[PDB]
Subunit: 249 residues, 3 copies
């Protein structure tokens, strides 16, 4: 038996809203340490990695390590029935279904759902040092990608110790954004150690941006010929990293 | 002459946005106590019963009982030219084939004057047995609508069940099941509260497609009443103001 | 070099919004006294008449009086990328392209650039039978509502009264607007200076276009006389105005 309790139900709500259109099916991998999800997107370009930790949950227990294939879209549906202040409570029974329990606080309302669960079959993500690491705000990164998605299909991200520039070009013109190294946690911090210039796909960056309601900031980690890492930290919980290789032939 | 003056024009706006995709064309029965409307839905499944009483009108005049057939879509489209705070006046002539809607704007700045084509509708008076139900549940408007759409994504049907300690709503479907439980409230101001009075535990199944229709009457009241007994239709009731009410009748699905 | 600077970029965004749906390609006629535009729409039916006087800009430069062929829809997709308190500056250098630079209010700095292109007429001054001043949103809601009733609005003006009418398959409507009186609050008041009474009939789809400029002013004026086009006027703060011209129907 596995029964984890999360006071911050909105966190689950937001995770699933993020991933629901990115992947359709994913193997949540339940452990003594916490929850882990590693997957490639349906078109097998980007790579998602979610980590939630025992310590984050109000209550956590896991007597057998589980490997649940879940339909992201169906879980999205079931969680959408939860208020953004409910105490979601996940539970299984070494397992054919996944039980969810929403508990709206300060109201005698209690919801109790069971999701049909899938048979699904990992992958490698080597923690490595990155040439440059921008910690900017989530809203601004979102904004920037949204806007440049109307000029071109791809984005050119250039970095150095003075600031970060994001560029794009299409049939309908040319465009540049220039952010400068900058107080209240709403500032840019480039810690670049090497001349990093990389091109990525705005479709998939915009897919990444949906985790924005999870963090006020977002870090972008990158080096030559190495998949970009967009990470949104969750809280006490771990993180929701996104990996995208730049386009080269 | 028929002439009725409603200060809260929003009442009529909301009544007709509630009854629009359900009923495509109804027959309003105007008389001395007020306006009544009573109609099957276009799929002949649910029954709608609106009652606006003469007392809620600032000015109520009816010289001759009317059965004026209105295309509810055209009425909604005309009432969408009325303002949330507009005083709305209904006027028809005794020998009239049109209904004149007249919207007075708050500071007398503007007055709108619309005229809507009537039509002849041959409609029988579907009877409505006056029953006493096994249990009645008072509960917030929005909370009910919230349960009813949420379960609409898990199943297409909703099993309501009633006992002295609260009321439960359940559904099943091709991705699992769900079950929402509400308890009788004591304290909750007080518009928000889930009270029940019961004579007998009931457990009935209803199509969610139609309950969601009904929940489009929510703007009308911060509460809703569910009335239930075995082998008799569910009644979902919204009081308008201390003026009348909108009632929906849905029939359960058969018992194994 | 043309270089014009505006601290309320919101105003240009609103202009491109108030124009992108009538014209696709326009010719900014830019000179020392301000920027101008006076174009017919895609169906040669309506007339649009943009005027940003240079004294309204915070930094205005014009070395020569140029005609910039500008795809308004592409200009608008670019203008979408700027913020509402943003600080927008246009530049055209020696000859060829248009540049749009948005200074975030913040550490952001945006540099967009679009291609120009290789694409007039006369509008005379006039003393109209009827001038009606009203709140922009009110006239907007009138056109919005009456569009759901019919495809043509009869606007008839007389003393103590302006009256909008329409009719269609489901019925007919007639909205009567009165001149506000002993409370003269200026931008929520209606005012009818009525030289000689008039009836005119206009297509509501074009008026409904014009109302897209509604966010530019809290008032609007309607100038109108027999057998001559109606002038819908949205005075852009205090640097110019925007003007729509529509003759009666059939």
């Amino acid at each position: 038996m596995f029964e984890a309790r999360l006071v911050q139900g909105s966190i689950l709500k937001k995770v699933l809203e993020a991933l629901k259109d990115l992947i359709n099916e994913a193997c949540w991998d339940i452990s003594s340490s916490g929850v882990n999800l590693q997957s490639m997107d349906s078109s097998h370009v980007s790579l998602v990695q979610l980590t939630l930790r025992s310590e984050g949950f109000d209550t956590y227990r896991c007597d057998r390590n589980l490997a649940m294939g879940v339909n992201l879209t169906s879980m999205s549906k079931i969680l959408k029935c939860a208020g953004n202040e409910d105490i979601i409570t996940l539970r299984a029974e070494d397992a054919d279904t996944l039980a969810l329990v929403f508990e709206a606080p300060n109201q005698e309302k209690v919801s109790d759902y069971e999701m049909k669960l899938m048979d699904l079959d990992q992958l490698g993500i080597p923690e490595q040092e990155y040439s440059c690491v921008v910690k900017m705000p989530s809203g601004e990164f979102a904004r920037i990608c949204r806007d440049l998605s109307h000029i071109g299909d791809a984005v050119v991200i250039s970095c150095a110790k003075d600031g970060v520039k994001f560029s794009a070009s299409g049939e309908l013109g040319n465009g540049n954004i220039k952010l400068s190294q900058t107080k209240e946690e709403e500032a840019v911090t480039i810690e670049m150690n090497e001349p990093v210039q990389l091109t990525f796909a705005l479709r998939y960056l915009n897919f990444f941006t949906k985790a924005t309601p999870l963090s006020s900031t977002v870090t972008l980690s990158m080096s030559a010929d190495v998949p970009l890492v967009v990470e949104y930290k969750i809280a006490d919980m771990g993180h929701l990293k996104y990996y995208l290789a730049p386009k080269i032939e």
